[model samples]
Target: PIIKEPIDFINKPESEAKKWGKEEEKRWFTKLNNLEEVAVNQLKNKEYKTKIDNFSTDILFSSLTAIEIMKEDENRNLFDVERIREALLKNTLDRDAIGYVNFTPKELGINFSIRDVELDRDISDETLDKVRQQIINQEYTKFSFISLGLNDNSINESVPVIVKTRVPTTFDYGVLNDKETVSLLLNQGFSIIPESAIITTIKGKDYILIEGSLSQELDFYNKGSEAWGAENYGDYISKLSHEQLGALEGYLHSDYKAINSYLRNNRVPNNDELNKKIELISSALSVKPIPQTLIAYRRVDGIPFDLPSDFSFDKKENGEIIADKQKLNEFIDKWTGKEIENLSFSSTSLKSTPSSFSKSRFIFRLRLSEGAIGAFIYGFSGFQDEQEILLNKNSTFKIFRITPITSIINRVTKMTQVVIDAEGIQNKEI
Candidate 1:
């Protein structure tokens, strides 16, 4: 009644709007009249049937947003303008042909620009043939994201070239050595995520990382001047037993996982870039296995395993008596009454403190009898009487109450003397 009032009220059907008389009724009626008036006055606003028109407004807004991001000087989004646009356009054209009904739209759609894509109709047979020819030499667009640690934040950042940091070893994590290993890593497929670089700014700014089979990498360490010798850290992995090597391998695996998880969670971006990076990582790790062990080789008693056969032993009196491998083996067999492959003949001096006795000359022999009860033998000229010790179960070296023959006792004393000279003064030993 009141709503469809008078002439317009003719056959419009009844409504609850009639109960509310003057004010409210007029208000709604007035709105209807205004809409009618606009319908009559406006001509530009119109609607049309279309396949993509439903999202045209959304697409327009996306374009505006993209323009804003690129136009403004300050914004997190950049105008990367990736090759994916052509891929999108190709998909769009394919969908347009079928009226876009075969697949369901899965995300909030956005349109940035009229990207170029190869169209079936745009190229004649000549141009298409040219494309096929070009395809013969086509290559994928390679992408890499590297940071040179140019940030101002005090918080440490991970990089590909870590140049000094404390590690669980006598040697500083060496950068020079790491570089060679890094080259190996690069060939193996390590990058991005768990990949990181650090800087210690100490000991010539070193780094500690890389990979390979145990022996191969150990060769790298030994052949290079990174692990031992007087020119290096002065300590070598030769001192570590097989069990120790196994422990070290376990640490390698543990460290890889730790560094990997840390980078994966904290450094790798949770985005499309990460997906690409993961692809590269997957491809690399599949072919290039991570190094799981630190290898070391021992030439019995600190001798070079590869010494030339023509090398002659230098004859000297007290200049330092040198023994050939055969002679050394014979000497060890005579002393231990056992045929052994490797026997470490080394001397060490133990200085007594106020609570104990004076300088004790000790002779030590590392037994290569790996499966035997004695991994090492120590002949110590302790304050009491000369005694021999054995490492039982490869653990603590226990001294046996029974003294060895006089000759063995003297050999032990000589070994200890050599170590004393090597160690130099009591206070200056490293």
Candidate 2:
């Protein structure tokens, strides 16, 4: 008759064993309230090297309470008052509780990282002070918690720090407030469901703290079009190259209703229709100049090109090759001393995909001619860490070298080095 899980309460709606007397229920609520009060007091009075030094205890408590409420509302999970109390105590009292201040101020035009704090410990003091001053001076700010450790124990002890800055428009607020929309956004990795969030007003404006990459959030905002069917279209458009987006701009506006309905119904259009659409888009992109923003972004932070193990130019051109090393080597050898033209747009990362996520045994050491065109497509990518570059279809490269090398991804591997020296279609269009 005992409830084995919190969700079991819903199943045994009328079971006598599930019923708590009014007094028992009231006492349990009173205990949680008392624990919260004690935790708040301790947080305020405690003096430690690394505490929640920037924000008030009231803001912290309110943020924690909001998270608790959200968990129950969204997931049907009970509020873990005891766990919250422990986190508050550990963060305030434990000197080893590493604190990080993350702020992406539009005014500063930079994202602060945890490494920056760790590298220069004194900066935490100065940064936190600056953040506090900014909030006081009516600069937009927000607060949220991030986990520092791998295990639950460390997570419980992790500091709830303020990562304050940026103002979300009313439309952003609306998307965030809608549970279904928020769930969709979460699945797409476009938004962060904060562990805790604080709402505070400075001067006349209100700020609510949530965590997401500023560039990514800005990209999301830019994708916003007609709200009625925007979510689905926004997602589809978010993955498009700058060239593709530009090509489709007029088509998107003219066929908005039809496209919206097609998306809503989850149906692919006729093969002929779809192919024509793609053909037109591709044709348009072929002649369009690569956006300067893409070039500039890649110049600043793009990583060297590496190919995932599963990717093969030969396999793509021909049918899928058998998983034999000799056959693969032969296919690769065919490209040696040859000029290869990609039939479709090819993607490579600016940052190497993390070794854990990649089985990449091959790295491309490309020497691109000054006029070679590759657009930075990270802004349109769904994954935050993907620093992607989209090379134009028919982009020509000359295979010059294939030398054996050692890398973190493999003990022994060959670098399929190529020189992109051709002033091909990409440069011709530009």
Candidate 3:
């Protein structure tokens, strides 16, 4: 036996020491030495012999690979079982509530009337149509009060507005002479009006019911509970005089109709001035259109839309990411499926540094691209103008394209499992 021991033979009890065999003592010492030597060999990356249990338990790397193959033989537990379970438990993947809806820009139309601000009477058909043409031709969707007629103290003095109607709206009034007293326009068979009459009430008071320019009425109407002392102003387009109702339909001039009809049909409004308008809008909004896709969101927030999970700005790896327009545009192109060759970006920095950790490092004034105008006319930023001008022709914009977003976590988890398994195999011997 290759055992070396400094036996404290005297410490053993006299009877037990006599009973104990030298062979048993030698075996214990030998086992400990073997373990110590095995440890040393392991540290030195050398081979070491083992006892029965260790020998039985050890398996070759190739032999352990059989476990994976055995699992493939029908006892394997894999698939979306756990994923389905969590999704069902969390209710984040609901497909049951979806429904369908259909509409066209033509489905939306405004009923309005306009009158001379000073005359308090409906303008002539010629005059109304002339104004409509002026609006269409002059790019006049909005108008500011010139302060020409009613003094600054008059009701609409502070309420200059862009035009929304073909003719002046008209109203009906019957006076019960008294004094200046307040009355709601809706209480008298009409919605609170823009073209209203001052009435004398039995309580000896005067009140101006909104019945004037559509702008004045809308301004007062918008004040709602605060101004009118009511929950709602009134039903939309209700209680208009027959003349006023006629103007709403009649004042859409032939040229105005020709222009707007083309604008509202969605897709591309036309190949001419609409092209110019698209550019104007893009210039105003500061965004470029994707090459094949005719849509682009205004770069107001950061990227034109939200981010993919892997590229989230909040990640530690993204610390150096700033408001670089080029970088943002590069990412947009990457996710939007456009090749970088067809795309370019320019940005003007709005601030040197963000004041808070929650703030983004860059704010941008966008530099436009060649076909950018076409994109501007379709996004939500241009959506309002489409309604205001194209209502006459009945057009609306449709979203042509946006990049899809997804998380890499699902793919990463799958790749990790395979990578770890392969590396683990390298640690075992055949």
Candidate 4:
């Protein structure tokens, strides 16, 4: 039962080995080149309202392309005066060993960079913009070709669209909550594309999009604000479910441990400088796990879930009126850290769903009645490119709506309440 030697694919012949490598490498390069192009194109949309969206796209494309080029690694062919001179000096030094003379040089087959990564130099903002745009265009162009493959302008949509945009592992194709991107999209009759249109091969990440088809809603109307009271809200999870809360706690704990260890170990130029740096790192990584977003929903009931119909705003003189909205406001106050005002509650017929949410059950929106969702996105490491930008020193991102349109359309209008001119009626009698 003992095998003496390992099997050898290279034993057949040198010619056969060369042929196999040539065929396989050709296919691999072709695919890689195409993907880079698509990623760049998406990122290059300067008009894109979310800077994080735009900037992350640029970084993803450039990084992948650079990696692809590096795979071939024919540094011997990659000759330049500076690169060649540096290589020659390194080789010469290696040959002239400290103890004795060394071997002769073979065609300078050195690889790897001798210089630091080329970073942006003294430049204007406009120039930086141009550079980013160029990178976007180049990467997208390459991606398009590879994606199409041998077919004529054809690509596969079998993979979940959200999975394509993820930088490394999980699917997260949620759309940016910026007004301009939304306005331009819905107003211009543009077709919706899953936010994960481009796949980054290197990151091995997946992005799960906002489950578009599941359009659920919550309704708090006719019942008045009493339904949102403390007596009725014993099992409310504003930003997450019970399961999510547990997971969030773990994340917060890890963040705390990481930063504290760093503070105790790392040194700075001076005590003042060290304190300043720790202030930033501690602020960002510290704190209890809070929700970046809050969600609430209930059935379509005109009255409380257990409504006795005993309270009414229209009728002041009522018997033992108890559904005071102050009760609801009190409960809302308790959950104010979860942003109560941004809470949207709507109840519309299946037929009355907004055109955008036609496929959705009901649409619900949560705004920064308290804190920014962008903070949550950045905190959660939503994308691979985003991690370095957001979690890094002095790293920041933000999102705000130019128009926080919260239209809680309860019912279709049919002249429910009409104001009359009482003075006009009196004058007519005169």
Candidate 1: regions farther than 4 A off: 1-171, 174-312, 316-338, 341-388, 391-430
The C-alpha RMSD in Å for every predicted model, in order, reads: 35.4, 21.2, 37.5, 28.5
Best by TM-score: 2
lDDT (0 to 1) per candidate = 0.21, 0.31, 0.22, 0.22
| Candidate order, TM-score descending | 2, 4, 1, 3
Among residues 3 or more apart in sequence or in different chains, the pairs in candidate 1 whose N, CA or C atoms overlap within 3 Å are 4-9, 159-197, 162-198, 164-200, 164-206, 174-207, 175-206, 175-207, 347-415
Candidate 1 lDDT over 159-249, as tens digits, reads 1122111111121110101110110000110111112222222233222221111101211211222222223212223444454434333
Q: Model 2 clash tally?
A: 2
lDDT of 3 by residue, 109-197 (tens): 11122344564343355544433332222110111111111111122211222111211212211111112111101010111112222
Which of 1 and 2 is the better model by TM-score?
2
Q: Candidate 2: global Cα-lDDT?
A: 0.31
Query: How many steric clashes does model 1 contain?
Result: 9
What lDDT is obtained when candidate 4 is compared to the true structure? 0.22
What's each prediction's TM-score? 0.14, 0.26, 0.13, 0.15
The digit string of per-residue lDDT tens for model 4 on 1-430 reads 3323321222245444345334543433343334332322332243532332322222211222332343354322112211322221221111110000000010011111111225311223343233233222111111000110111111122221221111111211111111111100101001111222122221342211211111112222111222222232223224344444443333344443443344434532345643444444324322312232222211121122133333221223365423334533332223212211111111111111222322221122121112311122222333212111112222111111011011222222111110000000001100
> Which consecutive 10 residues in model 3 have the weakest lDDT in total?
415-424
- Candidate 4: which stretches are off by over 4 Å? 1-399, 402-411, 414-430
Error of 1 at 219 (Å): 20
